[PDB]
Amino acid sequence: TGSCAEEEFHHYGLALDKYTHFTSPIRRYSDIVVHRLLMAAISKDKKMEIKGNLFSNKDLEELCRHINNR
RNA sequence: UUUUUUUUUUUUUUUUUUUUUUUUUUCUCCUCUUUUUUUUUUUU
């Protein structure tokens, strides 16, 4: 995300401007990330706090390079 | 009518000890050929 600029967020091959998967938490790894985050989102718009941290910049970038490799 | 004598199975038992798997060689060595390397996408 905000590690880069907006222009580098698009999904040109599909004419979208943002595209990921969320339909497979089981056979992949970015999707469990998306699960934790989506549930943090549905859980955060109540004005409370989600104890237990989630990620950081460097952690996410090393994870995404690992996933590219794999 | 044929008496008397010529030994036998070595003696001994009431001695201390503080180590340790194995063990010891063999040299440098020409990997052949459409490629940059493909890559989104969805159904597990």
Burial A40-56 (b: 16+ CB within 10 A, else e): eeeeeeeeeeeeeeeee
What is the rounded distance in angstroms from the CA atom of residue A5 to the CA atom of residue A37? 21
Q: Say whether the CB atom of A12 is under 7 angstroms from strand B.
A: no
H helical segments located in chain A: 30-44, 57-69
Please enumerate in sequence order all residues whose Cβ is within 8 A of that of A64, keeping only pairs 6 or more positions apart, or say none: A30
Amino acid at A58: K
Q: What is the resolution of this structure in A?
A: 3.7
- List the one residue out of A58, A20, A53 whose CA is nearest residue A36: A53
Selection from A23, A33, A22 nearest residue A67 by Cα: A33
Which method, experimentally, gave rise to this model?
cryo-EM
Closest nucleotide relative to residue A11's CA, C1' based = B40
Yes or no: say if A31 and A25 are a contact pair by the CB < 8 Å rule: yes
d(CA A54, CA A50): 9
Instruction: Give the CA count within 13 Å in the CB-facing half-sphere of A31.
Output: 8
Q: Which nucleotide is nearest to A26 (CA to C1')?
A: B44
